[PDB]
Design a protein around this ligand. Structure first.
Ligand code: 401
Ligand code: 401
Ligand code: B7G
Ligand code: B7G
Lengths: 260, 262
């Protein structure tokens, strides 16, 4: 079976792309969270985490400081997501502008998907896994900043119940980046064709890697839809931070992604 | 290090551009190492080149057919320029969005600077130098399209009077692409810093490669200024074509480059 033959190799390639670009894989992340990273749960422990136990604009307050490290995390992941996508021959063949349009509208989606990897019901891993910030502490932050937090956890725990691994994730992230309906795409048919190849690869892969999971594939299609929505609710809160939190900075890259 | 810099840009140029000025100049003069290009100066010759000899939208008229080939040439050049710019380690470290902005406001400046390499007072080479389209025939074209051509020639001949070789050109085009004052540049200081390195490289390279060239460095900076003016007018001429020549297509990539240019 040619089609099934190509796809399996095309899926392995993407996997190798994911493996050499992301500093944090679920394999690595899931081991740390089970069986030790310094637990951050208050101001005192965070300060400790900054001084050495684990680890930006001038300090301002606690909630704004966490928001900044959240921004940085995005700036770093966006680089990795850039190298990931470039490592797909099909992607880098498109003119640079379409590549930008894809990354711009898809990185946050890919981010919250991958965020589920370093997350469990009680908190998330930080600083290459050396730290673990508690969800309860994250909630305790100031209302404007603590709102962008909780939705990510609700999505993450429900997502982790699907029990996907890095090989599935690589394909998943690839399918999110290569999306045909992004605003202003120049070569839609070319991008659409690629997304279809990635999905067919994911489909076969899921049958091989998860032979007993009932409707995993359509479920993952729904999660892609769930992510597009999660990004929207997030972008809205990000819009509220820019309006009401006038004293707090916004990294230039995030500024360019959220621009209309 | 600064030399290692120029050498890397030179190997990047030679590796990403099939048609270099050396090869271009070899054919344009007469060297044995090459075949003779077919001369296209009318409809019969062009049609002759289209079939075999030398070598899209349905053929409507000659002026529009050529315009289209000019559009394609630009598109493939833009592919080569992306690969070139990318081959500069420092450039690729910039966020993609900034790489696009740089390429958007720079590709045409680069293109009209390299047009000089394959151009002469009587015409220009086409299809890998296997054809030579006459300047005359280009002027013969129906008014609107005959206009976006002559200026390129006017500039090219003059630019060719500075007798630059591919080694100069490698750094020259690099200096164009990494222009720190492009509209919407996210990380300006970084692009301005990389630009400075490139120019110091150019200045340093022109002393060795051109021991007698009086004021060459400042002359080229003026050319870079000249090139920006040439694109502004070029863009203006195109947006006009898009309005009045409502039936003539415009490649989506060109539509996106010109869109915000005024
Ligand atoms: C506004 C930042 C992000 C979105 C976002 C939204 C939620 C979220 O996590 C729940 C993270 C990722 N955050 C982190 O990786 C992170 C990193 C460090 C710390 C802390 F506390 F240690 F400082 C807390 C964190 F949530 C990112 C963006 O909009 O680009
Ligand atoms: C308008 C299309 C170009 C601009 C432009 C302006 C001038 C010019 O050359 C003088 C070329 C490049 N043209 C070609 O490479 C070219 C290619 C094929 C033919 C021909 F004659 F064979 F049809 C004629 C040509 F000038 C391109 C663009 O805006 O990107
Ligand atoms: C290497 C050649 C690159 C050519 C790039 C042309 C880019 O055009 C710009 O693409 C942006 C999205 O990426 C749009 O938001 C801008 O409105 C548009 O003007
Ligand atoms: C790999 C990460 C890429 C992040 C890209 C963020 C891109 O923002 C967009 O950059 C375009 C120029 O490139 C501008 O024309 C658009 O107005 C701007 O919204």
């Amino acid at each position: 079976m040619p089609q099934v033959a190509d796809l399996k190799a095309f899926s392995k390639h993407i996997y190798n792309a994911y493996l050499k670009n992301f500093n944090m894989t679920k394999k690595k992340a899931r081991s740390i969270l089970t069986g030790a990273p310094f637990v951050i749960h208050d101001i005192e422990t965070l300060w400790q985490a900054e001084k050495g136990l684990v680890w930006l604009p001038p300090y301002k307050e606690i909630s704004v400081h966490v928001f900044y490290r959240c921004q940085c995390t995005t700036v770093e992941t966006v680089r990795e997501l850039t190298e990931f996508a470039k490592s797909i021959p099909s992607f880098s063949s498109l003119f640079l502008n379409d590549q930008v349009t894809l990354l711009k509208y898809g990185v946050h989606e890919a981010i919250f998907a991958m965020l589920a990897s370093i997350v469990n019901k009680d908190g998330l891993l930080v600083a290459n896994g050396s730290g673990f910030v508690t969800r309860e502490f994250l909630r305790s932050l100031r209302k404007p900043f603590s709102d962008i937090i909780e939705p990510k956890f609700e999505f993450a725990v429900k997502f982790n119940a699907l029990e996907l691994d890095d090989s599935d994730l690589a394909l998943f992230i690839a399918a999110i980046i290569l999306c045909g309906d992004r605003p202003g795409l120049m070569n839609v048919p070319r991008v659409e064709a690629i997304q279809d190849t990635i999905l067919r690869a994911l489909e076969f892969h899921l049958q091989a890697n998860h032979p007993d999971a009932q409707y995993l594939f359509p479920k993952l299609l729904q999660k892609m839809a769930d992510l597009r929505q999660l990004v929207t609710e997030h972008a809205q809160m990000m819009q509220r931070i820019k309006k009401t939190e006038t004293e707090t900075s916004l990294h230039p890259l995030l500024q360019e992604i959220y621009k209309d």
